[PDB]
Amino acid sequence: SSFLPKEEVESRIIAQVKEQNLAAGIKVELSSRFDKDLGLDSLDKVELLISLEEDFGVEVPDAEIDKIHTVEDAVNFFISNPSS
Template sequence: MASFARSLRILTRNPVLIRSFSSKPHVVVLRKTLSVPSCLTSSSNKLENHSQVRYYCPEKKNAKQSEDEIRQRVLKVCASYDKVTADKTQYLQQERGYSSKPPLSLNMISERVLLVLKLYDKITPEKLSLESHFINDLGLDSLDHVEVIMAMEDEFGFEIPDVDAEKLLRPADIVRYVADREDVYE
């Protein structure tokens, strides 16, 4: 669309260029009939009535248009162009949508940690508290500890490095780590 408008501006500023184009094309039709020898017509009847049609448009060298005619023609094109763009173009208003995680609190984090641990099949919910040790109090081994850490990664949506995972031996440690990671201080 911009290139069309740019071309239109160039045309309106250069009347010599506009005069070189003819506003009313004159088409001359020439018909040329081929004469086919009789030796070829007997083998193929398609060549008998062959005619060739050509069209050409001669230039009018002496016909000059006035500036008013050119201006009217250009304004007519511009007016029709404006109608097309106004009718057929509908713009959608763009909106940006922002989202974030729900606000976390220490109580919410501790409830989510305890819920994940209660759903783990090797932990008895009666023995579970925020201060219970995974290995000493709950009887988990190192492989179970890794599975608990992986479940916490899935719950909170971020990866816990192995160096930090070795230090998380109580649910309270996990709550403190998640709160530090998510910048929750209340």
């Protein structure tokens, strides 16, 4: 179901994740909860999702925002969606 290469989208999303003040230093990879591993706040999570909105020209449902929790979940969501 991967519309575009898994390596490219993961590299791009982690590149945008690095841009946030924290969420860096020793652990920027997969299996990292936004609020339980990276110290991100909920508003910071929403802003990062909007930055991915700018990067990948595709919208995210708000209920999906309630569902997304991890770096894996965001890349899976963006690869799944055909507009990508």
